[PDB]
Amino acid sequence: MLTDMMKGNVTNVLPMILIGGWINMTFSGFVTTKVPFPLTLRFKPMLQQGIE
Amino acid sequence: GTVGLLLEHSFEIDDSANFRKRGSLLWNQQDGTLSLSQRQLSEEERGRLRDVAALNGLYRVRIPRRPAGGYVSSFVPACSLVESHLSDQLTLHVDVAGNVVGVSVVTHPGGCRGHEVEDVDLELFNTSVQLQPPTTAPGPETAAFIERLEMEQA
Amino acid sequence: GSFVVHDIPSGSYVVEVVSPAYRFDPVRVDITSKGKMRARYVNYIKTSEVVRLPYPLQMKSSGPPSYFIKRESWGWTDFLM
Amino acid sequence: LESSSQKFLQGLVYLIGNLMGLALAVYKCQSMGLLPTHASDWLAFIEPPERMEFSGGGLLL
Amino acid sequence: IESSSGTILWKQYLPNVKPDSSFKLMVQRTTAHFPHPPQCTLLVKDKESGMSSLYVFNPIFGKWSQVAPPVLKRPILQSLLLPVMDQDYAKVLLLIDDEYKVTAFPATRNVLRQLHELAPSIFFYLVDAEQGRLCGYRLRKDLTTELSWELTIPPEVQRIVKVKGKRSSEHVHSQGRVMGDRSVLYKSLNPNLLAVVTESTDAHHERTFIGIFLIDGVTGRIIHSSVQKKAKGPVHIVHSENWVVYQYWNTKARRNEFTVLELYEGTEQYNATAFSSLDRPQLPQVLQQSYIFPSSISAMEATITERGITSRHLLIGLPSGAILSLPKALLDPRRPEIPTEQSREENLIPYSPDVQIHAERFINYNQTVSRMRGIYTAPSGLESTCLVVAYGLDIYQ
Ligand SMILES: *[C@@H]1O[C@H](CO)[C@@H](O[C@@H]2O[C@H](CO)[C@@H](O)[C@H](O)[C@H]2NC(C)=O)[C@H](O)[C@H]1NC(C)=O
Ligand SMILES: *[C@@H]1O[C@H](CO)[C@@H](O[C@@H]2O[C@H](CO)[C@@H](O)[C@H](O)[C@H]2NC(C)=O)[C@H](O)[C@H]1NC(C)=O
């Protein structure tokens, strides 16, 4: 019962993060869209993964 | 020992060239120091500089190439010269062989902000004169790299 | 396959066999005014070193060069971590 | 927690507690720098200055 | 030549052109004005006679345009492509003759009025290499020039060999750069900065030198006057947004060397609304660093993008025929000799005097361009692709 409830609780967020990782690999190296507000420069390392 | 170089200035309503003797530069090649001995402006010269400043004209400096084999000259906004309380710096750039290359004049502070200036201000020449010989560029650093790689190998 | 270069004054010269098919390692050659002359491995850092190489330069090639870079082609095992 | 009027004061205390967290948030910023307070984060906002004096030419043709 | 397939679309001939004549090609009007034809101007100058002529043609179809070029009676010295445009969107072109008069083109009434209202902001600089003289002339209202500034590098010890100024058709995205520390260091973006490089007339292997002067184009002020000792030409210099990079030969150690000059201002910019060469009393500080390039060189030109967002690369042209794409970030002069926390924050590689020529960096694989003469870089569209045309014996794109 503990394993089942822990797996059920885990499956509410972890699939989203795994999909995010798969997307990050599959679509690495692009510039998809421009966020219409001026985000801070310190946020660069996570918004622009895969860009030099 | 010491060599004297003439130094003329010019400023007119039409911004033409009417260079007149202003100061002598005593460049002592031994110790590498330059000192200027200029005469202060007169009433008519002060007025002429005032109209040149009004029309946003230029103040041109010129020195002979040799202690009449040529001339090297430059210019500075004269209205910026009068709005800086006649505070400027002329740098004499020469080359490695000790020949005159150029003269560069720039005021302090530069630009203009519309500051009205009274006549009494223009009775002093706050000029900073420097001589700039060519600065040797550094070669590639090899000793540090070889010693560092020797430490890395060991 | 041999080569000869003429009209060389005394000094130090890096000899390289340029060929788009197969690269060749450059070799330095020091020729003196008297006539004796020697070959060695180039080293632009710490040039004072001497690593002698026989004068009849046997500059064997190192196979075709690598102008191209292979595709990444990451696998799922790369996605794992 | 509205047993009496002190709830209102309690609410302020609650706000104070929230303020405490907010204060910690500031510390978090000091521990992360994720705030556009320095001039560096304004670098992308600087438009290039316009050229006032144009000068061309080169070696004699 | 169509840049995609390499085929030839139109050919034209200019009768009676001497082999040593000097050319200058200017794009007066591009194709973004569909009701009007694109128009380019080529300026030829016979060396022996000195007379110069102007041939204007449509760059797409190749036929001479009906706009008759002016007859340049006097020999000319220099030409300028002013960004001001006529009503038909033709960029004004200025020529300075031997009597130092100025001839405009198309020189219509509107162009004459526009450049008469904007006359005092136009400066020419003429570099007479024979006498070792540099002159800088103003532009009066009535289309005449006056001696604004003049410098003399004595030909008896130094001859001017290159006057590479920064390209006019480029933009700079980041005015300053992040230094870490939550601080910013501002580049000294001077658009009128010459980079005159001269050799020593003394050809002895031990006393030769190469000078580089960062002469300003308007006020004549010498920003930098570096002189590298124990070095000999030929020298290949590229001048970009901020930095200059000039490769040379070092006679003492027999090895080709780079030397990067980066111009930096103070922690705060002197002026941001506009830049004027008459209002720069603060001499920008210079950062220098010399690297070793393990081969010779034949042509250099930085990769240029439309908005400058894409990083800058130098297209080193080796004698072998390859085109090395050296990253400019490698040639940073701020790379410390001993790594520190500041360098790690900025991610600066420790200073390494050796620059690698790894064969995987070549922009061409085996299409070697023998006896390479020049590299032209065009911004193209997009932001990551820069068009490259290496011209020499072979021509490669
Ligand atoms: C930056 O330089 C300009 C040009 O010298 C200074 O002058 C300003 O120029 C703009 C553009 O023509 C005008 O709109 C302003 O009115 C000018 N200012 C003044 C006071 O005349 C400008 O002042 C400089 N900026 C700073 C901050 O010094
Ligand atoms: C005379 O000119 C010199 C410049 O050579 C002035 O010195 C500058 O003074 C300002 C403030 O007064 C400082 O911010 C600068 O750093 C100084 N420059 C140097 C190079 O030290 C001097 O102030 C001028 N004197 C007068 C009376 O105006």
**How many Cβ atoms sit within 10 Å of the Cβ of residue E285?**
13
Q: Which residues of chain E have a CB within 8 Å of the CB of B93?
A: 222, 225
Tokens (6 digits) for E228: 């590298």
Q: Say whether the A–B interface has 3 or more Cβ pairs within 8 Å.
A: no
- Strand duo C37-41 + C27-31: pairing: antiparallel
Closest CA to E216 of E268, E165, E262: E165
Tokens (6 digits) for B12: 């007119």
**8 Å CB contact between E70 and E105:** yes
Shortest Cα–Cα distance, A6 to chain D (Å) = 30
In angstroms, the CA E163 to CA E105 distance is 25
**Distance between Cα E53 and ligand 2 center (Å):** 52
**Backbone phi, psi, residue B81, to 5°:** -70, -35
Q: Which long-range contacts (CB under 8 A, 24 or more apart) does C68-75 make?
A: C68/E360, C68/E365, C69/E360, C74/A25
Sort A41 into a burial class: Cβ within 10 Å, 0-12 / 13-18 / 19+. Answer: middle
- The ligand whose atoms approach the alpha carbon of E282 most closely is 2
In angstroms, the CA E226 to CA E219 distance is 19
DSSP calls for chain D:
--SSTHHHHHHHHHHHHHHHHHHHHHHHHHHH--STTSSGGGGGG-PPPEE-SEEEEEE--
In angstroms, the CA D46 to CA D43 distance is 6
Cα nearest neighbour of D33 on chain A: A42
In angstroms, the CA C16 to CA C6 distance is 15
**8 Å CB contact between E18 and E48:** yes
**8 Å CB contact between E389 and E313:** no
> CA-CA-CA-CA torsion for E117, E122, E124, E125, nearest 10 degrees?
160
Q: Does D24 touch chain A (CB under 8 A)?
A: no
Shortest Cα–Cα distance, C64 to chain E (Å) = 11
List the beta bridge partners of residue B58: B77
Place of tokens 């850092």: C45
**Which segments of chain B are extended strands (E)?**
2-10, 20-28, 33-38, 58-64, 71-77, 87-94, 100-107, 126-132
- Strand duo B33-38 + C11-15: pairing: unpaired
Q: Which residues of chain A have a CB within 8 Å of the CB of D31?
A: none
Place of tokens 């706000």: D15
Closest CA to E348 of E359, E339, E356, E357: E339
**8 Å CB contact between B103 and B92:** yes
**Structure solved via:** cryo-EM
Place of tokens 């604004």: E148
The per-residue b/e assignment along E309-335, b for 16 or more CB within 10 angstroms, e otherwise, is: ebebbbbbbbebbbbbebebebbbbbb
- The ligand whose atoms approach the alpha carbon of B125 most closely is 2
Q: Which residues of chain C have a CB within 8 Å of the CB of E360?
A: 66-69
Cβ of B24 less than 6 Å from ligand 2: no
Shortest Cα–Cα distance, B128 to chain E (Å) = 13
Whether C44 and E292 lie within 8 Å, measured CB to CB: yes
The per-residue b/e assignment along B120-136, b for 16 or more CB within 10 angstroms, e otherwise, is: eebeeeeeebeebebee
Whether E366 and C20 lie within 8 Å, measured CB to CB: yes
Cα nearest neighbour of C11 on chain E: E254
Cα nearest neighbour of A41 on chain D: D41
**8 Å CB contact between E168 and E26:** no
Tokens (6 digits) for C3: 């080569």
Closest CA to E307 of E124, E162, E173, E148: E173
Cβ of B85 less than 6 Å from ligand 2: yes
**8 Å CB contact between E247 and E323:** no
- The ligand whose atoms approach the alpha carbon of B111 most closely is 1
* Helix, strand or coil, per DSSP, at residue E252: coil
If contacts are CB pairs under 8 Å, which of residues 18-77 in chain C contact chain E? Answer: 18, 20-21, 23, 42, 44-45, 47, 65-69
Which residue of C79, C80, C81 to mutate against A (max A Cβ within 10 Å)?
Answer: C79
Shortest Cα–Cα distance, E182 to chain D (Å) = 6
Tokens (6 digits) for C37: 């002359």
Tokens (6 digits) for A33: 């869209």
Q: D43: which residues sit within 8 A by CB, 6+ positions away?
A: A41, E174, E175, E176, E177, E178, E184
Closest CA to E390 of E294, E315, E313: E315
